Design a protein around this nucleic acid. Structure first.
Ligand SMILES: Nc1ncnc2c1ncn2[C@@H]1O[C@H](COP(=O)(O)OP(=O)(O)OP(=O)(O)O)C[C@H]1O
Ligand SMILES: [Mg+2]
Ligand SMILES: [Zn+2]
Lengths: 739, 149, 54, 298, 99, 99, 422, 125
RNA sequence: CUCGCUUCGG
């Protein structure tokens, strides 16, 4: 709401119609303001979130914009013109609850310990779950149903997503795309993309003997056809092209041009061609072919469940996509209205202000957040269950639901692998916390100490990599790719170049990141098997702080912790002084981490801050969880999500559809440090009972337990159940009303 | 694979000898031992795991696969096939498990849970098919089993 | 083995001229007559296991 | 018991190898009566169960061996007068594996389903040298079809059953005597039985379809009973033999092994309503309406 | 189930309520068994929580020592009152006249 | 079932024929053995195997009072109309003890 | 590891700054060179640099198939057209090499000529990759298409004079939508036409064996003294690091670096707000030795008070006039009065009883606890003790400041006695 | 061929042989200097702006370290990608607007890469 | 009411 919306508006700042040129509508600046209610007749009024809860209304703020346009060729400007309403996340920058004291919270009828971070729509609390999805623009080598080891890359830019495949179905490589009638040999594509000599193609693929032995059949198949020039391959591809349902407008029986456009734009979108120079795309497809050939021997098939290839979409990215779609629809509707009105009406010049319907954006946002189904035709994205009703069974219930993560695959089928607990979840996701049932393993919880990166500018990374000796790919032929000491350096799926002595490059990059000249969330990792240095700067990656260890002694000393306790320094000071650094999953693949000081050896690069941060929020309630069997921990996480107890300090004024309270809650006698951190003891959800472990009367055979009548008579386990009964008295279209 | 088999054998030797020692040193009237002897609940393996030493954690009948590159967790060396780095849990439940051992144990538990989850649906479909096919038959009065027709 | 034309870099095939077996390119008049023995061994993997077990 | 079965692993049946599907997938494959099953096992008994040399000889007789697996090197030589492929047989490995394969056996193996290589093309020069001289077929074929041969000349079968993939020498370590059997991961029971040195009277198989087509419907019934009981026993849970015998009799009472799938159920049962209720409701109902099939309520 | 953590939690809670402290059951750490055993023996109770117990019914001592201590029990929302269900003839569905 | 919140259904047949069929064919006393292999399914379970095992251990020795109480624990319901038949004591000279 | 050997000098030459190109053949191994191949022409474009070499290949050599040469020469050209023939003779005699531009800017690349003890660098005006072009096949296909048109016309031996008058199909210059105009501008054909608009420039070839090669090879050197201090290249390592990495553009939010960028008074205020109890020597250490002690003392006297030789942040700094107690919501003036009373009690005695403070100030328990925790710790059987020890060194060094704080505390004590009726 | 190193490269280029050699070194984007009266801004300082004469020294230390002292700062020089294809350094001099000369200066065999010693620049300040 | 969606329970 502070940056992205302005970027979206700047992308769509000017709208005009083809009919009647010199007419335009230009957006200047956009504001969201503070939350308000439209109850007052043409007047706003500040509203607390609890008031929105009680009145079954939405907690939103007015989307206003200042514009300049032309009515009758005279420029008219508006400085504050409402166009929509944003549902406001609680405790956000614009939320009224932010920066408030507990007394002020009491005046606003909101619990100071409420986690916030959820929307209020039509009186219900909806939470947008963090989505998990495979990273885009990455080469994935995988086996098919028939066992053939092929490749796939889902090249996705800001506009188009296209998954292109490479197959080895008959000992030779074909490239498959949705825009081609039939998959075509890779050598024909190589010839079409500028490089025509077969020797250059073989040099790009690799100079190892088995590589030539594997790639020979493709060359023979290419030579069987008479394709030897770029024009011939372009003609072949254009023949293998399919028209998109009689595309309106015909630019001269296009074919070769269609093939060249598909090669330049549609195929491998993330790889950019400067001006119809396919050198970089040729290198990329040669690298893909080489990876397929190498993986066709030793079965080094990459696994999808590795979380170094996973990305997390928060509420911000989803809301950005939704607002972009809604704003584009609004501008399209405005342009269509302009086309329908301006050229026929009257000397009464058409102006947009009489037609800028304000319920479009507001209704779209409200419906998308409430129903939870997102339909983006501009992206062809049909998602369901994005938002869920916040569970108010207990404080732990809401807190643990606030940190949930949904999977891209659903309990719709018996899958295997994602459901499993991969070792990559270390420090990032809670191992024990998972819903017991059909969704076991597909809904996960973040660890206590974790962070999700945002997007970076990507400029200084390129500048530093260029200054660090990375040779340009265009300057050398593909044979250098096959050298044993030459390492490819990527950047978000794009070949940044080549380098020798990758150790120096990696050490310098890490040193620069520690110094602060590079953003601390930029990750650098090395894959020695593929000899590829990956530099990741996209958002959504999981990161975790670790104490830097240099020569068997941690950078953090007792004096530093004493200063932190005294308040001289904070965590950011530790970050800046090269004492603690964030590690990504891909980066921590290359590091050596010591759990404790006594485990530190000569080859240790990082130190674990605290092992108990491995567990999540719900699993933090378990006393001595390392002494139990893991299924017991999972059951306890599930059970405690459903534990009865207090909700918050405003639980009396709050009116929910179903509420459970405990008469005399008590804080636990054996409390984890996680309980202290989340202030669970302020809102306990249980009672301490004098349990005696023995067999009695045979009434406790299978998991049953015997309760004391006097204890129940004295208030033990006494509980309160609050239910809601709501009615509406609405006035109808006819001037008659319910009474 | 020979090295994997030998390492599994040695870890099993450690586990079972520790269990034998703990059972020998255990006194009578020990409630876990009493409940294991009469067979009401538990077994000697559970007693050994929760007293003496937890066994090697097995995923699909093998040691922990390397989630990262050439190693299960970053806390161990690359290409390290040491027992502690591949799933073995020297500590017992009474002593408590270190974070790596706890993670491997949780891996095994989640494997069991997902196995049960898939098994329920698969056997439900198989049961439906079998009953829909076999329900017609009846033992007649002439001692001959006959179909509906 | 795989051999490439020094002229244009396309793959060389084996054909017969009027005097001798020669390497030839499909897209240019370059040829190369064969003088002596030319061989390309591969050494395929042999079945090494005796397969006694139990 | 399907619910009770744990779908365990490491039940290698004493060989520490040869992954065989056991559990619910095994029961599903057995009751489905699929023609081709995953991991089919053929157990073969030897006439001389005590000798290892005889066991390896019959294993080499039955197991498929490719040309590239025995030839020490294959080289494409382009002499100034002619170009041809030379294959050098490693006689040391041939006698080590005790394969009854010479140069002439390889020559006879060639000229079989290889672009119709003429017998005159193949020749023998030495004791373990094979020369192949291909000629253009004129059907989009030139002399530079050499590569094609280079692609598949090592992939021609010289000895063994082509359907058989791999046979292993299993040994029973009985205190009285250590006797040798063959475990064949193939799908050709008739060929294995017909091979010399194999006591075909006492060779079984896992694929119920192959056993049926080879040895009759009663042999198929016995195989079904034994396989189901063995699979159930592998998980430690017991089922009375009468239940599995009844199931096998139902599967094999029409003279053909019929699975419990919708196709076999359609072939077995006759009532329209049950067929419609189980699967493919609309298709069954429309076909019954077309045929005018009157259905009783038996 | 091998929930040794429950036994350790019971012992730690007994020691803490005896000496007026809040013991920690932090993962991969927390108060060790030896310290709570020393606290229990210092306070006059058995060092393992097992206590001599007289049967309420017969009024005679039990043959085996009983494991006493405070455990943090939490009530769940699943109640028999909400879950209890009984159905008379009742209503039926319009499409298929079934309950 | 495991008494951990499991819900069970309960149907009431509305016909004399159905009631008789249920009582005869599906009586609990009539289905003590599973049809799969004839093994008994309805048998003693936890806290009954343990209790009986402790009771039948060679260590146990009861005087007349405790043995009488334990035996009289069963004299309810249809067993209210039977003579107890206290077995003769095993050890009787030094002390009168029932094993 | 000292620089033991080879202290080589590096010279720069700009004689061939704009005339130096690097030609690399990706398909030609370095062992085989083009020294012996007679070149025929070189076309080049100064802007949008694209060099096309035109070389001659011999025919009498055994590595040439004269039959295939005749066939390809017949295919590319006509039978005896020769008006625009890619080959002068009836055999394939000429080979075309076309250049691809590797990168736009070549400023970071330099050619280094090495001589005994010296290395001369020269900037490269451009780098191009020369590849054997296949253009005669396109011309052969075009001639094949026109031959096919001739074959179509040849269906009848005599063709009647076609009344194929070109009806006037003068097309509407349709005003193109700006999207379609942008598409046409970005079309490959438009870019190729724009490239072709620039005229070609013809160049003769002078090989390595030519004497002109050795003659112009001397231009890579520069006349200059062996030891000269360069007027430029004098920027410090910090300046160089700044140049090659240009910049993009709780209450303890600011970091230590951000604190040090702030004015000294703000730094002292923020440090006192964060710590609320700290000695003067620690403040001197934290701010930095480069800051004079008198200025630090002046700054701290405006935001802190002296208690037992230590410095405690003023109450009004912690509680602004618009703030209130987070626990009770009382106005900040009452909190300031209570904290002033607590600090006065700490000046009077090292131990403070919590119950006495609660009774005197009439405040709630948690507010008193917050007041005490900021500057005191709990000592069992003794109450609350000041967190820091009595610092007599600072008192000895600055008696005047001690007297200033003494009479300030006297005034504050008078105010507190008036307010709380002590 | 074993992978050679810059110290051994120059050592054999001067001690083992006295023949001149043509090298191709890639310099960093900005040199540690200022455009001398080039009408500026902290912009890029390339070789196109510097004048003739000695611009720096090449240091060959012990243990094979190869540095380039270009004034106050020192870069490090390492081997580039070992190219095996033909690379001809030629001079294309358009002496006339209608006719120009191509002068094959020599052959390029080895490639050097010069990078800023970032560790020294960081520990310096 | 119908329908779908989620969250549970087991
Ligand atoms: N999806 C399901 N289908 C059928 N029955 C289920 C399902 N989920 C739960 N149940 C019922 O709950 C029971 C499962 O309990 P079980 O798996 O044996 O113990 P558990 O849940 O592993 O407890 P521990 O973790 O061992 O303490 C058996 C079954 O009747
Ligand atoms: Mg249950
Ligand atoms: Zn050629």
């Amino acid at each position: 709401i502070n940056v992205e919306i302005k970027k979206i508006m700047k992308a769509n700042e000017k709208v005009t119609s083809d009919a009647d040129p010199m007419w335009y509508l230009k957006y200047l600046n956009i504001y969201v303001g503070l939350p308000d209610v439209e109850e007052s007749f043409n007047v706003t009024r500040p509203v607390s979130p609890h008031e929105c809860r009680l009145r079954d209304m939405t907690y939103s703020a007015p989307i206003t914009v200042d514009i300049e346009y032309t009515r009758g060729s005279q420029r008219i400007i508006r400085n504050a013109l409402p166009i929509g309403r944003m549902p406001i996340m609680l405790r956000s920058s614009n939320c009224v609850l932010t920066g408030k004291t507990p007394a002020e919270f009491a005046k606003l009828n909101e619990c100071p310990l409420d986690p916030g971070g959820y929307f209020i729509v039509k009186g219900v609390e909806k939470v947008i779950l963090i989505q998990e999805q495979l990273s885009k623009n990455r080469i994935i080598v995988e086996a098919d149903r028939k066992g053939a080891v092929g490749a796939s890359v889902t090249s996705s830019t800001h506009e188009k997503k296209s998954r292109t495949n490479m197959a080895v179905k008959q000992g030779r490589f074909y490239l498959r795309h949705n825009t081609l009638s039939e998959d075509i040999p890779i050598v024909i594509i190589f010839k079409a993309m500028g490089v025509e000599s077969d020797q250059e193609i073989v040099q790009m693929i690799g100079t190892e003997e088995h590589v030539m032995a594997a790639f020979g059949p493709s060359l023979e198949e290419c030579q069987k056809a008479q394709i030897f020039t770029q024009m011939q391959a372009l003609k072949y591809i254009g023949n293998k092209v399919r028209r998109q349902r009689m595309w309106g407008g015909g630019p001269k029986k296009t074919k070769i041009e269609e093939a060249r456009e598909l090669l330049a734009s549609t195929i491998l979108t993330h790889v950019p061609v400067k001006e119809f120079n396919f050198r970089a795309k040729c290198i990329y497809t040669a690298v893909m072919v080489r990876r397929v050939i190498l993986a066709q021997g030793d079965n080094k098939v990459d696994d999808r469940d590795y979380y170094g290839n996973k990305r997390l979409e928060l509420a911000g990215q989803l809301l950005s996509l939704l607002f972009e779609d809604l704003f584009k629809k609004f501008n399209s509707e405005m342009k269509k209205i302009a086309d329908q009105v301006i050229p026929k009406q009257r000397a009464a010049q058409f102006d947009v202000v009489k037609h800028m319907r304000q319920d479009q954006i507001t209704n779209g946002m409200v419906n998308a957040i409430s129903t939870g189904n997102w339909s983006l035709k501009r992206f062809k994205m049909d998602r369901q269950g994005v938002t869920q009703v916040l569970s108010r069974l207990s404080y732990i219930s809401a807190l643990g639901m606030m940190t949930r993560i949904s999977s891209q695959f659903e309990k719709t089928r018996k899958v295997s692998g994602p459901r499993s607990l991969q070792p990559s979840q270390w420090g990032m996701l809670c191992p024990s916390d998972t819903p017991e049932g059909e969704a076991c393993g597909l809904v996960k919880n973040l660890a206590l100490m974790t962070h999700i990166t945002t997007d970076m500018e990507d400029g200084p990374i390129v500048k530093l990599a260029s200054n660090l000796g990375v040779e340009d790919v265009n300057l050398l032929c593909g044979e250098e790719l096959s050298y044993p000491n030459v390492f490819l350096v990527f950047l978000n799926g794009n070949i940044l170049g080549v380098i020798r002595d990758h150790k120096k490059l990696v050490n310098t990059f890490r040193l620069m990141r520690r110094a602060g000249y590079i953003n601390e969330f930029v990750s650098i990792s090395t894959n020695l098997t593929d000899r590829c240095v990956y530099i990741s700067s996209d958002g959504g990656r999981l990161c975790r702080p670790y104490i830097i260890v240099k020569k068997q002694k941690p950078a953090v000393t007792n004096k530093h912790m004493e200063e932190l306790a005294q308040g001289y320094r904070n965590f950011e000071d530790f970050l800046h002084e090269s004492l603690v650094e964030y590690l990504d999953v891909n980066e921590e693949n290359d590091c050596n981490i010591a759990l404790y000081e006594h485990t530190i050896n000569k080859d240790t690069t990082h130190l674990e801050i605290e092992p108990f941060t491995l567990l999540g929020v719900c699993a933090g309630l378990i006393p001595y969880p390392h002494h139990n069997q893991s299924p017991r921990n999972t059951y306890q996480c599930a059970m405690g999500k459903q534990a009865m107890g207090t909700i918050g300090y405003n639980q009396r004024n709050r009116i929910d559809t179903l509420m459970y309270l405990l008469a005399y809650p008590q804080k636990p006698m054996v409390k984890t440090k996680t309980i202290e951190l989340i202030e669970f003891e302020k809102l306990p959800a249980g009672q301490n009972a004098t349990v005696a472990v023995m067999s009695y009367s045979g009434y406790d055979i299978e998991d049953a337990l015997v309760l004391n009548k006097a204890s129940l008579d004295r208030g033990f386990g006494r509980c309160l159940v609050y239910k809601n009964a709501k009615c509406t008295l609405k006035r109808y279209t006819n001037q008659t009303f319910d009474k | 694979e020979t090295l994997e088999a030998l390492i599994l054998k040695e870890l099993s030797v450690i586990r079972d000898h520790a269990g034998s020692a703990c059972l020998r040193e255990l006194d009578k009237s020990n409630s876990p031992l009493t409940m294991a002897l009469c067979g009401s609940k538990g077994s000697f393996i559970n007693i050994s795991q929760m007293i003496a030493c937890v066994g090697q954690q097995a995923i699909s009948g093998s040691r922990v696969p390397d989630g990262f590159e050439n190693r299960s967790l970053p806390h161990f060396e690359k290409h390290s096939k040491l027992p502690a780095a591949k799933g073995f849990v020297a500590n017992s439940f009474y002593s408590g498990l270190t974070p790596t051992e706890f993670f491997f144990h949780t891996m095994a538990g989640r494997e069991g849970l997902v196995d049960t989850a898939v098994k329920t649906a698969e056997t439900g479909y198989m049961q439906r098919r079998l009953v829909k096919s076999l329900e017609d038959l009846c033992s007649q009065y002439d001692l001959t089993v006959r179909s509906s027709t | 083995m795989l051999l490439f034309c020094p002229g244009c870099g396309n793959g060389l095939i084996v054909e017969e001229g009027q005097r001798c077996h020669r390497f030839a390119c499909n897209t240019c008049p370059y040829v190369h007559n064969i003088t002596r023995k030319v061989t390309n061994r591969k050494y395929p993997k042999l079945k090494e296991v005796d397969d006694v077990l139990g | 018991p399907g619910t009770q079965m744990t779908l365990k692993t490491f039940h290698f049946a004493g060989v520490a190898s040869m992954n065989i599907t056991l559990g619910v997938p095994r029961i599903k494959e057995i009751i489905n009566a699929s023609k081709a099953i995953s991991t089919p096992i053929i157990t073969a008994q030897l006439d001389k169960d005590d000798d290892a040399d005889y066991a390896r000889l019959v294993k080499g007789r039955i197991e498929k061996t490719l040309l590239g697996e025995i030839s020490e090197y294959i080289e494409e030589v382009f002499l100034p007068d002619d170009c041809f492929i030379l294959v050098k047989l490693s006689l040391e490995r041939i006698r080590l594996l005790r394969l009854e394969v010479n140069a002439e056996t390889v020559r006879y193996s060639i000229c079989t389903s290889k672009l119709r290589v003429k017998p005159g093309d193949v020749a023998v020069h030495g004791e373990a040298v094979v020369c192949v001289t291909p000629r253009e077929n004129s059907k989009s074929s030139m002399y530079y079809v050499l590569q094609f041969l280079k692609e598949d000349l090592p992939k021609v079968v010289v000895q063994g059953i082509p359907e058989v993939s791999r046979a292993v020498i299993h040994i029973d370590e009985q205190s009285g005597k250590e006797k040798y059997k063959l475990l064949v991961e193939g799908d050709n029971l008739r060929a294995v039985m017909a091979t010399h040195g194999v006591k075909g009277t006492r060779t079984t198989s896992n694929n119920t379809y192959e056993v049926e087509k080879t040895l009759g419907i009663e042999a198929a019934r016995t195989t079904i009973i034994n396989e189901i009981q063995y699979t159930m026993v592998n998980h430690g849970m017991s089922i009375d033999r009468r239940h599995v015998m009844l199931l096998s009799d139902l599967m094999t009472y029409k003279g053909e092994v019929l699975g419990i799938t919708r196709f076999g159920l359609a072939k077995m049962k006759e009532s329209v309503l049950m067929l419609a209720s189980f699967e493919k409701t609309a298709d069954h109902l429309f076909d019954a309406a077309y045929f005018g099939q009157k259905d009783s309520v038996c | 189930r091998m929930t040794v953590g429950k036994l350790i939690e019971l012992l730690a809670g007994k020691a803490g309520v005896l000496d007026g402290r809040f013991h920690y059951g932090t993962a991969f750490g927390g108060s060790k068994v030896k310290d709570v055993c020393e606290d229990l023996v210092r306070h006059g109770y058995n060092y393992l929580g097992k206590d001599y117990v007289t049967s309420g019914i017969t009024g005679e001592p039990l043959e085996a020592y009983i494991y006493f201590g405070p455990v943090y029990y939490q009530k769940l929302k699943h109640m028999v009152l909400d879950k209890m269900h009984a159905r008379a003839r009742g209503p039926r569905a319009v499409l298929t006249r079934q309950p | 079932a495991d008494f951990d919140g499991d819900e069970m259904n309960l149907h009431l047949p509305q016909t004399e024929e159905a009631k008789a069929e249920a009582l005869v064919l599906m009586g609990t006393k009539a289905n003590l053995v599973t049809p799969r292999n004839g093994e008994p399914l309805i048998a003693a379970i936890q806290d009954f195997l343990t209790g009986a095992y402790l009771l039948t251990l060679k260590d146990t020795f009861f005087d007349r009072a405790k043995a009488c109480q334990i035996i009289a624990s069963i004299l309810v319901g249809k067993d209210e109309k039977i003579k107890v038949r206290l077995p003769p004591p095993t050890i009787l000279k030094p002390v009168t003890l029932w094993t | 590891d000292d620089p033991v050997v080879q202290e080589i000098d590096v010279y720069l030459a700009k004689s061939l700054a704009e005339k130096l190109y690097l030609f690399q053949y990706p398909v030609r191994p370095a062992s085989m060179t083009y020294d012996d191949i007679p070149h025929l022409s070189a076309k080049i474009k100064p802007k949008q640099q694209k060099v096309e070499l035109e070389m001659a290949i011999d025919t009498l050599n055994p590595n040439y198939c004269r039959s295939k040469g005749e066939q390809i020469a017949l295919n590319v050209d006509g039978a005896c057209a020769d008006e625009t023939s890619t080959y002068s003779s009836k055999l394939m005699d000429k080979q075309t090499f076309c250049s691809s531009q590797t990168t736009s800017n070549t400023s970071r690349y330099a050619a280094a000529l090495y001589r005994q003890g010296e290395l001369h660098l020269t900037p490269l005006h451009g780098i191009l990759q020369l590849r054997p072009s296949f253009s005669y096949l396109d011309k052969a296909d075009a001639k094949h298409r026109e031959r096919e048109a001739a074959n179509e016309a040849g269906d009848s031996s005599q063709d009647e004079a076609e009344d194929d008058v070109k009806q006037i199909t003068v097309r509407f210059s349709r005003p193109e939508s700006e999207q379609a105009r942008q598409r046409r501008v970005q079309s490959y054909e438009f870019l190729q036409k724009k490239h072709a608009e620039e005229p070609w420039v013809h160049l003769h070839y002078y090989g390595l064996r030519d004497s002109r090669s050795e003659h112009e090879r001397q231009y890579l050197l520069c006349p200059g003294s062996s030891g000269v201090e360069n007027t430029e290249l004098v920027k410090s390592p910090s300046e160089y690091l700044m140049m090659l990495m240009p910049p993009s553009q709780p209450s303890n939010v600011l970091s230590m670096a951000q604190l040090r960028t702030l004015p000294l008074a703000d730094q002292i205020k923020i440090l006192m707000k964060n710590v609320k109890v700290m000695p003067f020597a620690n403040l001197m250490s934290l701010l930095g030795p480069s800051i004079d002690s008198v200025a630090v003392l002046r700054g701290i006297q405006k935001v802190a008070m002296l208690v037992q030789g230590n410095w405690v942040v003023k109450s009004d700094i912690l509680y602004p006039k618009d703030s209130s107690s987070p626990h009770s919501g009382v106005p900040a003036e009452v909190l300031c009065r209570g904290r002033d009373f607590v600090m006065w009690k700490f000046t009077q005695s090292r131990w403070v009883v919590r119950k006495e403070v609660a009774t005197v100030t009439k405040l709630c328990a948690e507010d008193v606890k917050d007041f005490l925790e900021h500057m005191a710790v709990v000592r069992i059987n003794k109450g609350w003790e000041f967190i820091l020890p009595y610092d007599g060194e600072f008192i000895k060094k600055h008696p005047d400041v001690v007297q200033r704080q003494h009479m300030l505390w006297t005034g504050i004590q008078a105010k507190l006695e008036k307010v709380y009726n002590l | 061929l074993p992978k050679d190193v810059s110290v051994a490269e120059l050592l054999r280029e001067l001690s083992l042989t006295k023949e001149e050699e043509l090298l191709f070194l890639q310099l960093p984007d900005t040199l540690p200097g200022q455009p001398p009266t080039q009408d500026i801004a902290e912009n890029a300082c390339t070789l196109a702006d510097l004048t003739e004469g000695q611009v720096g020294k090449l240091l060959i230390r012990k243990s094979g370290r190869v540095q380039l002292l270009l004034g106050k700062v020192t870069l490090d020089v390492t081997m580039g990608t070992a190219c095996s294809f033909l690379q001809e350094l030629v001079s294309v001099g358009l002496g006339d607007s209608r006719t120009g000369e191509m002068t094959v200066l020599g052959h390029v065999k080895h490639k050097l890469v010069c990078s800023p010693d970032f560790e020294s620049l960081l520990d310096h300040k």
